Design a protein around this motif. Structure first.
Motif, PDB file in Angstrom:
ATOM      1  N   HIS A  87      -3.481 -17.460  79.878  1.00 36.36           N
ATOM      2  CA  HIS A  87      -3.026 -18.735  78.192  1.00 36.36           C
ATOM      3  C   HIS A  87      -3.889 -19.412  77.870  1.00 36.36           C
ATOM      4  O   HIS A  87      -4.954 -19.499  78.426  1.00 36.36           O
ATOM      5  CB  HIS A  87      -1.573 -20.230  79.325  1.00 36.36           C
TER       6      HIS A  87
ATOM      7  N   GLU B 217      -5.557 -23.001  77.245  1.00 36.84           N
ATOM      8  CA  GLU B 217      -5.205 -24.383  77.940  1.00 36.84           C
ATOM      9  C   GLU B 217      -3.972 -25.207  76.813  1.00 36.84           C
ATOM     10  O   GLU B 217      -3.926 -25.465  75.471  1.00 36.84           O
ATOM     11  CB  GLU B 217      -6.353 -25.199  77.951  1.00 36.84           C
TER      12      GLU B 217
ATOM     13  N   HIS C 157      -7.605 -18.160  79.516  1.00 35.42           N
ATOM     14  CA  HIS C 157      -8.114 -17.976  81.392  1.00 35.42           C
ATOM     15  C   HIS C 157      -6.287 -17.793  82.360  1.00 35.42           C
ATOM     16  O   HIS C 157      -5.467 -18.147  82.204  1.00 35.42           O
ATOM     17  CB  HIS C 157      -9.105 -19.104  81.502  1.00 35.42           C
TER      18      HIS C 157
HETATM   19 FE   LIG Z   1      -5.321 -23.732  83.075  1.00 31.68          FE
END
Ligand SMILES: [Fe+2]
Ligand SMILES: [Fe+2]
Lengths: 321, 322
Positions: free
Chosen positions: A111, A113, A304
């Motif tokens: 995803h 952030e 990440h």
């Molecule tokens: Fe995250």
């Protein structure tokens, strides 16, 4: 002090550029010498992050939360002011914090952030203060690569995504479930216990909050885009939580399959979503964490995740405007 | 280069049998030669004056260090290391220093001994002001043996019954964690498990009786445990219990502070006497306004602490000793 571009086993290369770029030290090293070199090499570092998308700093004297905070301070990016729509955060020092993620045995999906937030971080920092006993890496992947492979493999699907976008549905409890992948409750989500102030802060964030019977809350967001444009690098990126929601928004209150759909309500093709998951894994880079490691990620170009791990493990973070 | 540790007076301190509370140490006004203050010079003096400082803490119960160059978490950690007390075995800022997730600023944290219901509680405690509060936010401290002596004098029967039956502590835990609650932590997080069997086994290890509520939560009952302990180093009895703390501060949707703590035999505590104890704590306490750089050393066997409401900013770090 010199900042040396160092090769590591896990890194990949795209059009002659390393991913992630890795900087290491070649007067005896010290934290002040490092933070000073960072300020001195500002341009060099900005260009590296611009070309690579993520930069791992390995071998430097960052031995505590305070040191990490000083390093974040040396980069000088404006701090992201906290609002809501994130998870139970705990400030350690300065701009550094610890967020409680799902249990160690779980796999946190890929995803961007705060992807469903209006003012999401342009950059983020991850710092390893205590390396994991086993596993626990923070795999990262280039968002534009995922988009290019998706458009190449499934042109019609991508085409439909930019026309209808995606729709997100996520049920919340009143409290926070420590055992859930998406355990934050509506109290912590909206930093309030009052339903009025909540339902309002909810509508502001661009949501449809409808109070659930069991004191929880059912949130609906969208239609919103699945593809975005990175102005700084003139390319489109896979800026969405499609795979994360479809495979990870699973708990007593959420059916992943119904957590995300096309913006017009139509369901997503299971085989294509899982094909996207496959692309993410293939293109990702999972560098094993070392104590002292500081990873700088451009949130516009990288998604990440987190691999399962065996405690102990401690990774701190810092978000940039 | 040497540094003098001078006992200094402050408006808030009290005196019991000629002893100051808390004792206050500061650098001198005019020493010969004039010492250049620094963190390293201070930490060296701490090691050099070990005996003097142990004696001071022994006589006063708490020692405030004011006017020294403790300007960062790192500096504070060095000061904690200079004292050489063993660290209490376990958000960590640096070394042995951490930040405590306290209640919101508008709240008033009740008086308590640190980790009072834990088998291996800290013998000593350190508090450091990195950023002084805009307003209020002091850390009031009071002598535990004084509270005991006043309670025994005003309510002999009550104290007598406390020594006989002790106290019982009750907490109704939810399954998940309630963010908007002083005691909001659920049994999953409290016992680090989602499995009921393991959890009720871990509670028993912690000297606790666990009963699974019908709503998916849990109810724990600790005790009977003593309300009064003995300070071996000072040959005196201390008010080592979270009675007032629980009776007035353990309230949320699941818990009623009036049943949160009772006599060890289940019998309720007299509301009048508990509030009378609360009164004694406030009268005997000392609330010194925090100054940046301040370091407060507290002997957890002789002192209960708390926190006043405040207006941010405010930053006080801590460190615990075995
Ligand atoms: Fe995250
Ligand atoms: Fe405390």
């Amino acid at each position: 002090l010199l900042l040396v571009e160092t090769p590591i086993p896990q890194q990949k290369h795209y059009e002659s550029k390393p991913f992630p770029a890795v900087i290491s030290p070649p007067p005896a090293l010290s934290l002040p010498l490092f933070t000073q070199t960072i300020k001195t090499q500002k341009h060099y570092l900005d260009s590296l992050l611009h070309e690579s998308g993520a930069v791992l700093f390995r071998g430097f004297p960052v031995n505590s939360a305070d040191d990490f905070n000083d390093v974040v301070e040396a980069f000088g990016f404006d701090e992201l002011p906290y609002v809501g729509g994130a998870a139970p955060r705990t400030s350690v020092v300065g701009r550094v914090f610890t967020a409680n993620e799902s249990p160690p045995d779980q796999k946190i999906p890929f995803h961007h952030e705060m992807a469903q937030v209006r003012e999401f971080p342009s950059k983020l920092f991850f710092y390893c203060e205590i390396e994991p006993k086993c596993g626990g890496e923070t795999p990262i992947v280039l968002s534009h690569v995922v988009y290019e492979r998706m458009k190449d493999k499934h042109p019609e699907f991508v085409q439909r995504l930019e026309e209808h976008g995606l729709l997100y549905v996520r049920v919340l409890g009143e409290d926070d479930d420590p055992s859930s992948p998406i355990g934050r409750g509506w109290k912590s989500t909206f930093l309030t216990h009052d339903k009025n102030l909540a339902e309002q802060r909810a509508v502001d964030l661009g949501m449809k909050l409808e109070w659930t019977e069991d004191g929880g809350a059912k949130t609906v967001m969208g239609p919103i885009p699945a593809i975005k444009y990175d102005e700084s690098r003139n390319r489109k990126v896979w800026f969405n939580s499609m795979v994360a929601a479809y495979t990870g928004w699973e708990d007593k209150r959420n059916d992943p399959r119904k957590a995300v759909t096309f913006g017009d309500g139509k369901p997503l093709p299971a085989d294509i979503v899982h094909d996207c998951l496959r692309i993410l894994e293939e293109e990702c880079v999972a560098v094993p964490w070392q104590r002292g490691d500081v990873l700088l990620i451009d949130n516009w170009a990288v998604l990440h995740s987190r691999r399962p791990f065996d405690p102990p493990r401690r990774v701190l973070a810092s978000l940039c405007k």
